Amino acid sequence: NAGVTQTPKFQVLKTGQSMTLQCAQDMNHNSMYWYRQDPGMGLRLIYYSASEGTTDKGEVPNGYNVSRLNKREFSLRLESAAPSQTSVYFCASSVWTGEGSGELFFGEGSRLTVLEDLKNVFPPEVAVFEPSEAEISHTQKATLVCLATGFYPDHVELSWWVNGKEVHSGVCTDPQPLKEQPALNDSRYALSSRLRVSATFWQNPRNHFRCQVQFYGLSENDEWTQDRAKPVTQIVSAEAWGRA
């Protein structure tokens, strides 16, 4: 019971590069769809497959192609990637098409960024900042802050780890990153997160705190010619220990 499974979740592309998005559904559905989602407008259909063995264009098919390999799989192909194709791509499926009340089931989405050059791709710099002693005595709580700064594009996943296990309670992460230079079109990004715990939990010296940022960047096949290190897909983290 996987539902709709599409891969990959993130991908950076150079202009002219080819790319294939995969989509599989294990719900025995007949109709499958590929959408793109852009800020300020509704979902726009690229291509669709009413049933196994047939496909047709949607509203914005130019630059794309599809293949309904079988009843389960519906791949989306970008042969010559263009900057206008920077978007979030969603694959969907439904039991049938043409029936009125049938709803769509969406995949988790694929975020694509297409760049003229990879020279502006940067992984994040991650730092952890320990709680204020004034906060601890005033509120009996302790807030740690994690800053991930200078990354591009916005393909990051931030998580907190307490004593080796990921936590979600008491965590707040900015839903949108900030542009470090908002007047620039290629501005690098910053992201902040907080983990708030009780003063007693922070004052145990054996408790371990770590903020982790998964960055999705280049792979081995991407050409790199800059003097700095190749900004590959990587995990950048920073840690802190409780103190008494």
Add this chain to the structure above:
Amino acid sequence: MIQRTPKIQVYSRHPAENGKSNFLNCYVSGFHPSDIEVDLLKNGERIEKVEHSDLSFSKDWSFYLLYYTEFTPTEKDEYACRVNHVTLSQPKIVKWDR
């Protein structure tokens, strides 16, 4: 299952008059299922250039078809319609009565 035999009606497009070109119709209707064979006969021989409409559907779930060919009726030539169906043991021939 219930199978319905076709109703066969042979007639001319216009009121027939000897020596005047007309059209010989064979309207086959009310049958089920849809597989059916229809041939127009002239003096017992099958006419070649015979046209027919597409298979048509009725509200009662039966089907109908119109087979026709252009002709000029005389007094010596006899015309008929030959229809074969799953509900029929032998092909049924209906003569054009005038």
Add this chain to the structure above:
Amino acid sequence: MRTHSLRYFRLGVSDPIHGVPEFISVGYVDSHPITTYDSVTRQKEPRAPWMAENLAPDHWERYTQLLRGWQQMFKVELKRLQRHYNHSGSHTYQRMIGCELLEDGSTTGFLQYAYDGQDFLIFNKDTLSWLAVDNVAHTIKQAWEANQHELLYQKNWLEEECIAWLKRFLEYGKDTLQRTEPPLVRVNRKETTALFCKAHGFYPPEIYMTWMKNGEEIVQEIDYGDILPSGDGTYQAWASIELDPQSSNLYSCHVEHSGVHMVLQV
């Protein structure tokens, strides 16, 4: 206007012979075919010239894709029915949907299914339920009625969308559908002796022909003929009654067509 209707039929055959298609769908406005699709061409095509000239290729491209999906759905449903019936061999599955825009302005709507040419499921859009003829249909009825939203969708389509499509097609083919060709009526004598009242050359096909004996009509003796297509877009019909040689009676043929009544006294 007169009463007009829009109807769409589907036919599915489980084990057709080599040439015959397993799936066919045809649409009608009144008695005129407007559209067609089958599993051999796998294309949605017009069957009336006024349909081809008023619908852009995007319409035919879209419904070609839809019909290909509906073809597969019809096959799955037929496989389910014939398995639950435990029937071997070739069997048929049929669907009929449509609506009527009546003369006074009221509307009707209907949706039915058939198995082997007999009623199977019949939709009631006022009670929002399906009428089942046997226990195979009863199983389908329970599955379809568990989806309340789909019942509401079918009601809205029959009462709103179907009528809207009908008015649209009625405008496209108004030169054909809204015209009137009055019949030519004659009376003959034949020893079957019976009086034959014959009409031909009329459109629309709807016509009423009866015999009257001394100003009184008795439908028991009247033999009614079928309304038959002549092949040129017009129709013909007839009605016969047997003569009483033992008493004198005034016989007359009555023909009503498109708001005009006609009487031929013998």
Add this chain to the structure above:
Amino acid sequence: GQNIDQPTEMTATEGAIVQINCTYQTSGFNGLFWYQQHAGEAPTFLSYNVLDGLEEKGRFSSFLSRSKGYSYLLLKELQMKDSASYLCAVKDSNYQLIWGAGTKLIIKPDIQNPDPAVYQLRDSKSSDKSVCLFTDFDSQTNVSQSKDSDVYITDKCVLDMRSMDFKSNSAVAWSNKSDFACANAFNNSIIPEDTFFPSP
């Protein structure tokens, strides 16, 4: 042409009621869908209407008026989990979905005991940034962007400590400038009069 319209953004308070409108002008009508989409996640089906009237479904209800060509999604007893985008879509005569641009719903938490304060966080030996935390203020306070190009200020963020059933708003500002101080970090924002500034 075919058009769907819904507001870009709506803000309401936790526990209150919010009504998200959707108007449509389409070629025919075969139903109206509402979808929910949390940030960075997939849209999920909420409701569907074809005939006129109100349909209820838990805390959510969907209304449709075919003659007016408008629908609303009604969310009662708002919770923080309801913060998301809500997408309205209509099937036209050819069963094609026309999607609205979506409405982002922002929920303000009810801060029981506000304790607004700006705290200086401890420096990291691996970074040159100084970091200040504005926290525990009421949901009516807005956090303005930085006027200085070398000072970075994030928007407010509501955090939930489930173990204590406690929520709090916070915003972060940081910089590596020599004159950056927490006392002046949020000077471009209107902060509460009683904001606590612990002495350095």
